[PDB]
Amino acid sequence: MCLKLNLLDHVFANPFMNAAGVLCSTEEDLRCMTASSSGALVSKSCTSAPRDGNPEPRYMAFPLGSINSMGLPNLGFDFYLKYASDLHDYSKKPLFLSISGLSVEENVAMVRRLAPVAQEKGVLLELNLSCPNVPGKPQVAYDFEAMRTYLQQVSLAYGLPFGVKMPPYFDIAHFDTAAAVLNEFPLVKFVTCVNSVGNGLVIDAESESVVIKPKQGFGGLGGKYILPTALANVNAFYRRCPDKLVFGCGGVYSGEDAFLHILAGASMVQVGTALQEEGPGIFTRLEDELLEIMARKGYRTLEEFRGRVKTIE
Amino acid sequence: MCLKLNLLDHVFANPFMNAAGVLCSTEEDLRCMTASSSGALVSKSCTSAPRDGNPEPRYMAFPLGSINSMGLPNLGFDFYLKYASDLHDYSKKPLFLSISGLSVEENVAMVRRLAPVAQEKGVLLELNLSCPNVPGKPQVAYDFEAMRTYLQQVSLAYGLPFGVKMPPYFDIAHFDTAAAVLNEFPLVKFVTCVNSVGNGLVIDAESESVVIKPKQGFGGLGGKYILPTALANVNAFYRRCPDKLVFGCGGVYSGEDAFLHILAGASMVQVGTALQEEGPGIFTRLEDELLEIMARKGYRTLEEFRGRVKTIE
Ligand SMILES: Cc1cc2nc3c(=O)[nH]c(=O)nc-3n(C[C@H](O)[C@H](O)[C@H](O)COP(=O)(O)O)c2cc1C
Ligand SMILES: Cc1cc2nc3c(=O)[nH]c(=O)nc-3n(C[C@H](O)[C@H](O)[C@H](O)COP(=O)(O)O)c2cc1C
Numbered sequence: 001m002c003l004k005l006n007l008l009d010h011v012f013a014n015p016f017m018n019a020a021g022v023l024c025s026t027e028e029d030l031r032c033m034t035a036s037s038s039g040a041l042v043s044k045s046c047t048s049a050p051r052d053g054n055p056e057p058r059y060m061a062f063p064l065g066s067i068n069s070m071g072l073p074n075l076g077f078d079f080y081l082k083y084a085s086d087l088h089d090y091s092k093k094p095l096f097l098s099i100s101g102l103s104v105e106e107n108v109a110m111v112r113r114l115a116p117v118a119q120e121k122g123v124l125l126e127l128n129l130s131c132p133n134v135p136g137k138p139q140v141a142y143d144f145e146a147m148r149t150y151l152q153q154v155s156l157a158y159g160l161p162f163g164v165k166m167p168p169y170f171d172i173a174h175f176d177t178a179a180a181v182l183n184e185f186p187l188v189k190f191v192t193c194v195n196s197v198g199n200g201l202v203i204d205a206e207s208e209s210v211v212i213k214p215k216q217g218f219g220g221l222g223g224k225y226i227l228p229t230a231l232a233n234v235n236a237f238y239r240r241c242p243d244k245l246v247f248g249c250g251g252v253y254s255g256e257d258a259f260l261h262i263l264a265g266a267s268m269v270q271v272g273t274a275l276q277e278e279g280p281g282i283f284t285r286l287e288d289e290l291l292e293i294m295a296r297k298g299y300r301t302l303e304e305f306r307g308r309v310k311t312i313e
Numbered sequence: 314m315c316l317k318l319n320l321l322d323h324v325f326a327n328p329f330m331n332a333a334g335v336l337c338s339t340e341e342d343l344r345c346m347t348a349s350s351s352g353a354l355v356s357k358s359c360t361s362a363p364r365d366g367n368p369e370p371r372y373m374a375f376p377l378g379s380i381n382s383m384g385l386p387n388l389g390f391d392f393y394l395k396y397a398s399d400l401h402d403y404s405k406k407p408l409f410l411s412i413s414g415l416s417v418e419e420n421v422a423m424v425r426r427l428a429p430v431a432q433e434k435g436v437l438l439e440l441n442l443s444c445p446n447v448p449g450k451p452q453v454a455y456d457f458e459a460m461r462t463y464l465q466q467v468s469l470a471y472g473l474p475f476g477v478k479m480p481p482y483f484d485i486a487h488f489d490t491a492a493a494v495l496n497e498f499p500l501v502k503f504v505t506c507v508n509s510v511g512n513g514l515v516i517d518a519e520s521e522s523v524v525i526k527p528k529q530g531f532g533g534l535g536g537k538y539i540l541p542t543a544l545a546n547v548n549a550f551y552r553r554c555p556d557k558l559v560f561g562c563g564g565v566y567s568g569e570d571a572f573l574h575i576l577a578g579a580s581m582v583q584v585g586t587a588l589q590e591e592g593p594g595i596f597t598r599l600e601d602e603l604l605e606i607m608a609r610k611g612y613r614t615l616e617e618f619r620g621r622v623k624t625i626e
């Protein structure tokens with residue numbers, strides 16, 4: 001009875017890892033995650049140039065989840081490349097490197113230089129398709145024209161196996177169209193569903209005030225709020241993308257959340273808000289919790305139930 | 314002291330009402346809704362001919378909220394118009410009628426026949442733009458030109474003041490676009506935000522099964538899950554539609570959920586999932602709690618804090 005997986009030519013102790021943005025911005029952060037029991041980690045989404053991000057407060061958490069508008073605070077690509085290149089201990093667990101260029105050309109340059117490190121060290125690319133486009137347009141994943149462009153270009157530039165981090169969709173025609181774009185691109189080996197539920201608004205009853213300063217308090221939702229929307233996207237894309245892996249991200253607080261996520265067809269399972277709240281000790285708990293779910297049900301491996309959610313009649 | 318207000322040339326005993334779909338399909342239900350302390354009611358969305366809807370189970374509720382895919386079960390527009398014109402007691406509260414016809418022409422035929430009863434009897438139109446779209450395309454409000462035609466045609470057909478039922482958006486650029494479309498139409502004097510969060514998927518860990526029968530388990534999300542989505546949309550549209558009203562809907566279990574909604578610009582507060590679980594008694598509770606929030610804070614009127622959510626600079 002194990003949590004083990006072999007995927008994308010790499011070996012993982014368990015399906016669990018952090019979500020891009022959580023405990024992965026600094027070298028201190030990255031080493032923590034590497035010292036945890038996570039089967040993997042992913043670096044904070046980066047840009048060419050370092051960024052301080054938006055004014056604080058810019059993340060707030062509650063019993064039922066999190067709201068954020070961080071604004072891509074990151075140490076910039078050169079650090080994140082150097083860490084993959086010379087600092088990270090691959091003998092511990094695989095590394096994923098997230099990128100979120102503010103245009104097709106910024107992302108292209110980054111993958112070009114990332115190519116030879118991926119090849120020689122095994123660092124894996126998660127292209128974050130919630131990267132901004134021209135302001136006054138939806139983020140790149142809600143604009144299927146620009147999304148096509150970005151992947152045409154990154155494929156040519158990178159010419160290695162990579163992955164995409166997607167927002168949630170809420171209409172069947174959107175699942176249909178987005179999977180169709182993805183399926184044009186054989187090098188997209190995995191798909192991560194979902195990013196934060198876009199532009200929610202949390203209001204404090206006593207103060208009669210939004211809780212985060214940027215964007216008049218509007219921001220991305222994570223946590224218990226988004227788990228059903230997260231399972232839908234996982235399973236939609238699991239259904240419509242049979243040559244590609246899906247990684248689940250969305251309100252995982254427990255082995256059960258993880259278990260459901262896997263049932264929908266998740267391969268790896270990322271923890272965002274909960275990891276931020278609870279800390280890296282969360283991964284031992286999750287591992288134990290899922291294993292006690294599989295023991296009771298008779299499951300020895302993940303592939304025995306991955307994608308095997310039942311429907312009625 | 315008391316929450317009574319005036320919108321659209323009507324008197325209301327308080328800002329509370331059911332949400333289209335909940336406790337409003339049968340004559341029985343609408344008599345029940347009428348007999349309750351709600352300030353108003355609205356009838357199940359309807360089509361020209363009656364519909365049976367999709368296979369049960371097609372609604373389920375859990376602690377954080379609900380999932381459904383009813384398939385627009387309804388007694389049919391002839392019944393609801395009869396209720397509006399020969400059966401509703403207008404001295405008790407105002408009545409709102411919801412239409413969700415399967416085409417612009419289905420909708421046109423209904424409003425032409427509704428407009429005379431609106432003139433004389435004062436029923437109020439709430440048009441459901443989560444209604445179906447042409448082949449390969451997402452629901453109408455998620456296809457803005459299609460949305461413009463529906464409003465162009467209904468406005469021409471109806472030619473009295475009316476309102477619209479919106480699904481949530483998740484992008485600023487969509488707020489921007491969607492609001493603009495709505496501002497093209499002066500007869501749209503109120504906007505109801507938001508409809509259920511499209512295409513979530515609840516999975517049961519013990520059965521390893523989805524919980525509702527249609528759409529392989531996928532349906533709309535209501536309840537605690539969507540409150541931070543319903544407030545952003547309430548506020549997004551309140552700010553972008555100064556000459557209109559906004560009706561809030563989504564995640565009201567308490568006076569506090571209500572208070573925030575109002576703070577976010579909301580004139581009427583709709584109740585759906587919580588109404589469906591607790592029953593119409595909820596309306597006496599929701600009054601009391603809101604009144605109690607107002608007292609502690611020293612508010613005498615809804616007008617005093619409506620739309621007054623404080624931003625951090
Ligand atoms: C503070 C914070 C920072 C995040 N930063 C990133 C990021 O840099 N890149 C990215 O692709 N996703 C980012 N996300 C999205 C998360 O990866 C995740 O998809 C989302 O929070 C939902 O997961 P959760 O429900 O576990 O929080 C961030 C989320 C939070 C809360
Ligand atoms: C069983 C059920 C039936 C519904 N039927 C309709 C409908 O006919 N028309 C409509 O506009 N919305 C319908 N809705 C959506 C609600 O009016 C409301 O937008 C949604 O429940 C969000 O509010 P909540 O958070 O209180 O659930 C329905 C919701 C449920 C749960």
Ligand SMILES: O=C(O)c1[nH]c(=O)[nH]c(=O)c1CCc1ccc(Oc2ccccc2)cc1
Pocket residue numbers: 021045068069070071072073100102128130131132195196220221
């Ligand atoms: O870091 C974030 O703010 C963030 N939060 C999330 O929940 N998901 C994400 O993917 C990210 C990073 C993606 C993102 C979010 C806001 C951004 O803000 C802009 C920065 C520059 C130009 C336009 C928008 C840029 C990237």
Ligand SMILES: O=C(O)c1[nH]c(=O)[nH]c(=O)c1CCc1ccc(Oc2ccccc2)cc1
Pocket residue numbers: 334358381382383384385386413415441443444445508509533534
């Ligand atoms: O009745 C509902 O299922 C429902 N549930 C919601 O949460 N919000 C709603 O607005 C509605 C009614 C709107 C609706 C839902 C499903 C529909 O299903 C179709 C019927 C025929 C063709 C295509 C879709 C049509 C209208």
